[PDB]
Amino acid sequence: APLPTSCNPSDMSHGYVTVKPRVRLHFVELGSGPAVCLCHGFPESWYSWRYQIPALAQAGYRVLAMDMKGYGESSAPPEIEEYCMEVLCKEMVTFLDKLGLSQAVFIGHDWGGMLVWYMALFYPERVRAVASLNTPFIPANPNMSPLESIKANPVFDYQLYFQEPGVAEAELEQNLSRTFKSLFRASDESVLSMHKVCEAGGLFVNSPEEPSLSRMVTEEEIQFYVQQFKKSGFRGPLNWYRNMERNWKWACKSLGRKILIPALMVTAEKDFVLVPQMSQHMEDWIPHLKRGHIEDCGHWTQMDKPTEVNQILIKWLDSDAR
Ligand SMILES: Cc1ccc(S(=O)(=O)N2C[C@H]3CN(C(=O)NCc4ccc(Cl)cc4Cl)C[C@H]3C2)cc1
């Protein structure tokens, strides 16, 4: 079952676009062909797509893999409201403008999946096609506060823990190697319960001080993440979670419009947070939706099942984005 080719950071083309005076976005770029913009989740990196970038370039695409705002070599302003979906999506539009791209295909995972859905919803003229790994498209519900909705799903308890600035930062920054080795695990290897984080008082309070390495990752890979998060830390990344009311109000401005462009939703059997069933009935909002499903795959889709991800994405790109 041999691993796809990966990426060596020093061997990549590194690009930088200043979207505003204080905000510069970094990306890596490989390949010729139609532009495909890969958008990672929390707390990840462009390098989360290391197994996809060569494969998609070989398949005849120009891949732009982002450091999202708050991450890596991209700017990480401290202000919470710099990380609301309205701001982040408008910055990605400006990014396309500065690159001289009329459209791109957007592929996202986790919080990057949420972003690419909103790009498709509000900026469809700039989105050739959209794919999400794990993250569903959920229509805005103007009758339920985001607070209500969170409290009504217990696996989302960690999200409240992430609200108060500084608290989760201290825990996640205390020992970066422990942070990433604890998080980046296959489902069966989990050392963390995302429930009752608040009563425990932290994500890792009941996890090993010296976790083993997951089968999914090497020490060298973990240390790449460590080095990246030494640049700006966890405040910007966590700020993505601290705009729930603002994001809800923005999402309500879609006045029940549909997403009419080609779309792909990929579910992961063993993601016990972003569960497959959350995607049910997306077809009601997205008439041209196609689906994929990956068995034996947890939250960290790209590194858990890279071969399967690559096969799904290339088949869909070739049929629906080109
Ligand atoms: C309008 C709306 C649209 C989609 C959603 S969601 O799909 O429920 N989801 C998407 C975001 C990703 N996320 C998150 O916490 N990711 C990190 C993570 C996950 C799973 C594991 Cl195992 C470890 C880690 Cl660290 C929460 C955010 C909420 C909610 C509301």
In the chain, the DSSP E strands lie at 13-20, 23-30, 35-39, 62-66, 104-109, 127-133, 263-268, 289-294
Atom 6 of ligand 1: nearest residue by CA position: 135
Radius of gyration of the chain (CA): 18
Q: Cis bond leading into 43, ω under 30°?
A: yes
- Please, what is the end-to-end C-alpha distance for the chain in angstroms? 29
Give the separation between CA 51 and CA 90, rounded to whole angstroms.
Answer: 28
| CB within 8 Å of 180: residues ≥ 6 apart | 222, 225, 226
Retrieve residue 255's tokens.
């006045």
For tokens 């080609």, name the residue.
262
Q: Is residue 261 within 6 Å of ligand 1 at its C-beta?
A: no
Give the separation between CA 170 and CA 167, rounded to whole angstroms.
Answer: 6
Give the separation between CA 164 and CA 168, rounded to whole angstroms.
Answer: 8
Q: Is residue 73 within 6 Å of ligand 1 at its C-beta?
A: no
User: In Å, how far are 14, 83, 160, 276 from 244, measured between CA atoms?
Assistant: 32, 11, 11, 22
Q: How close is the Cα of 60 to the center of ligand 1, in Å?
A: 31
Atom 3 of ligand 1: nearest residue by CA position: 138
Give the separation between CA 45 and CA 305, rounded to whole angstroms.
Answer: 17
181 burial level (CB within 10 Å; 0-12, 13-18, 19+): buried
109 catalytically annotated: no
Domains in the chain, please, with CATH?
A: 9-320 (3.40.50.1820)
188 catalytically annotated: no
Give the separation between CA 192 and CA 185, rounded to whole angstroms.
Answer: 10
Q: Which H, E and C letters describe 114-159, residue by residue?
A: HHHHHHHHHCHHHEEEEEEECCCCCCCCCCCCHHHHHHCCHHHHHH
Length of the chain: 322
Among residues 83, 161, 241, 304, the one annotated as catalytic is 241
* Other Cβ atoms closer than 10 A to 186: 19
Q: In Å, what resolution does this model reach? A: 1.5
Q: What is the DSSP string of 68-113?
A: PTTSTTS---S-GGGGSHHHHHHHHHHHHHHHT-S-EEEEEETHHH
Q: SS3 for 164?
A: coil
Q: Is residue 248 within 6 Å of ligand 1 at its C-beta?
A: no
The angle, 0 to 180 degrees and rounded to 10, between the axes of the packed helices 219-232 and 176-183 is 120
